[PDB]
Design a protein around this ligand. Sequence first.
Ligand SMILES: *[C@@H]1O[C@H](CO)[C@@H](O[C@@H]2O[C@H](CO)[C@@H](O)[C@H](O)[C@H]2NC(C)=O)[C@H](O)[C@H]1NC(C)=O
Ligand SMILES: Cc1ccc(-c2c(CN)c(CC(C)C)nc(C)c2C(=O)O)cc1
Ligand SMILES: *[C@@H]1O[C@H](CO)[C@@H](O)[C@H](O)[C@H]1NC(C)=O
Ligand SMILES: *[C@@H]1O[C@H](CO)[C@@H](O)[C@H](O)[C@H]1NC(C)=O
Lengths: 727, 74
Amino acid sequence: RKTYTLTDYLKNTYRLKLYSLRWISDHEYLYKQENNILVFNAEYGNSSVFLENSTFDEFGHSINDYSISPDGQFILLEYNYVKQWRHSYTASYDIYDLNKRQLITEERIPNNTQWVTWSPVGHKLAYVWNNDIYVKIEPNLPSYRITWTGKEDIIYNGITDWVYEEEVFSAYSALWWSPNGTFLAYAQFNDTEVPLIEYSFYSDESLQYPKTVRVPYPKAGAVNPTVKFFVVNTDSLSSVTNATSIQITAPASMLIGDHYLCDVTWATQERISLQWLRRIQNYSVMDICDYDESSGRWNCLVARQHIEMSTTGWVGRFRPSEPHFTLDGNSFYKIISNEEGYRHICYFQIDKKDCTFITKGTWEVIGIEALTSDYLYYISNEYKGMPGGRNLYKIQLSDYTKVTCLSCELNPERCQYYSVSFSKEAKYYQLRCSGPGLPLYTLHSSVNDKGLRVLEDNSALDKMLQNVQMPSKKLDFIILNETKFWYQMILPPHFDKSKKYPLLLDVYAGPCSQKADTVFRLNWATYLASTENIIVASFDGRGSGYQGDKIMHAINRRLGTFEVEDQIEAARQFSKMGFVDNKRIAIWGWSYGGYVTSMVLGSGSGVFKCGIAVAPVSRWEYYDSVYTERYMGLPTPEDNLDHYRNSTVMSRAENFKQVEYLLIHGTADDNVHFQQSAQISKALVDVGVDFQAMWYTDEDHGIASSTAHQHIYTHMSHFIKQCFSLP
Amino acid sequence: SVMDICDYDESSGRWNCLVARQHIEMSTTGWVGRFRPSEPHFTLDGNSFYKIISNEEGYRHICYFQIDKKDCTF
Ligand SMILES: *[C@@H]1O[C@H](CO)[C@@H](O[C@@H]2O[C@H](CO)[C@@H](O)[C@H](O)[C@H]2NC(C)=O)[C@H](O)[C@H]1NC(C)=O
Ligand SMILES: Cc1ccc(-c2c(CN)c(CC(C)C)nc(C)c2C(=O)O)cc1
Ligand SMILES: *[C@@H]1O[C@H](CO)[C@@H](O)[C@H](O)[C@H]1NC(C)=O
Ligand SMILES: *[C@@H]1O[C@H](CO)[C@@H](O)[C@H](O)[C@H]1NC(C)=O
């Protein structure tokens, strides 16, 4: 008799269980059962105790996170967490002798520390504090300071600046240990001439004057951060004579000006691989560098260089692909765009440049997951030719024709979207199944591909969802101009197609995106279908990923065109299916999806009655260089300025007189600046179109505060119900 | 005085003087060169060159430069 309500979504009434584990070796792992930490085994099957909350109760502070040294002699405790950007944050840390569970009382790690990490083996500690790198050889000994040039908002040693964090590395750290822990590679960033985005921060009502936050942030075209790459030998670290870091420079063809470090990957104890991307992101280079023992130097040979370029677009999905190296270091595999657009695994000889593809066909490999001397494990969307499915494939390195799907046939109906987590030498592996059924977590022996045991099956959640009228999920395709274009639909319970349902188009449509897949979700859409009897739909048009460069590069230098068109055509196609109410079709999206929603509302197509845009881009000149330029080029008279000017939502203001528009934006959005939306509202004011608006004081791009998250979704519900005349 | 050595970039069409290949000439007793710095004579493969410069005795002599090293040899 009951439905999945807005409160159910906001108060998490029906929770998805996870089996988040972390491998400590090749035989055992950890799990948070209760909130006491337990060790687990797969070998003989048994699983004993290891830690608890009352090991660190009289501690005082609540632990945000922990981390075991590879050797298992030490545990690092993370508390005083203060979030910064999407990945960056600051924190305070304590180390215990995990053997004795007593805190290392002296030579403690400093407060406000910006990143910390163990070496891959032993118990070496590397942390960054005040933008400088430090090393602690034994947790109780004094640190050795590596760099002395760290300066706030200017020089970043071992950590990323704003744009390398969001766009290049998707991480705060710019530190990379060598496999045995002798060398610490790191990057240094210089934002000296990079302009600041400035915005107000209001804080608690106690703050009498608002604070102005100033972040180095290169918008399209602006001066970018420069970069340097170093390696230092963490064994011969003296105490009387400052550490000397050896610099590895970028190849010549990069230094001609404006480039990025986009990959760092070790090969052996004495071999590291770097990838550089020109600022025009259609040309990338990989340099392989050997440590010269009778020198203390790093040499990168010109012959060893390989080149990834693209004549039809940029290189990569969002970046050049990472290389996985065979144990000797003389060979590596990396996913690249194959001869005819599809992304597949190529086999590389270190010395010569002619690689050779080990997979082919009209599907893409998503990621290379594991490497042994025997086989190679990877994930892809081949099974049943479904771009939005994921399965685990194993390929025989001696015979490339002999491939095996390890996850495909396991639970066909329930499970079409897998991810995997291997043990430290790949003798065991966990399978995450994220849908279409209820997520299922299962442990396997890779030695004989036999399934060991069910870790978590969500039978608790399964139990209560029978008391609830839940929405169904349709995944299918439509043929446009002789091409397969995929869509998904969240359909009300008891869906009957002799009725005319109101339809909300849920859009992102960004370059290389996918909103049509086999993943089970419980979200705002679940509530709209379940309670409000609304169909929620998404569609992957030209520009979306995982279906070949043809489709993805289709909007190169041409944001705001074919991905905007195709969303409109998606609606038409859905209405043409005969179970949609033509007078009640809405469109909504967040971030890039905000931009597209707005362009669609500005397009005058007359299909959409109303729409919601949340933190949208309004014109591409306002957004950060790394992301924007990759798709647009430079906004200069001799490159792509014309299109920059042709693709703003401001220019389309007049057309919003045909729709109901809700524009929402957080005032502390470091990513997509309130500016972008301020320019939208001003344009609409200046042509005289009424619209709803909502700012969120001090919320960033996530609008992720508990109370704000609740507030916005409640607000958007009201808007859609009312637009749809729902009672 | 600073000598730059600049290569042509095929793929862009622009020229690149690598800071690594720059060579500095200077004097702490007078001006540089006889009436100006000396002209370089490159080997056929242009990876090395010869040049008249003042040696540690004040005498001008033919120094042999590689394109990637700071120090030549006389
Ligand atoms: C970061 O880059 C800036 C240039 O953008 C460097 O600043 C220059 O440094 C030199 C040498 O000290 C000065 O003579 C120049 O006047 C500086 N120019 C500017 C614009 O500030 C700075 O040295 C770099 N820092 C590091 C550690 O790489
Ligand atoms: C205008 C705009 C704003 C943000 C993004 C975005 C990006 C890129 N900054 C990335 C980094 C990529 C590596 C996925 N992640 C996410 C989740 C988002 C997003 O919030 O959608 C893309 C466009
Ligand atoms: C961190 O800061 C607090 C408060 O000022 C102080 O009492 C504590 O000793 C500091 N801890 C470290 C690791 O220096
Ligand atoms: C190391 O170099 C720094 C900065 O260049 C200097 O201030 C300091 O004297 C040196 N440190 C030690 C411990 O010798």
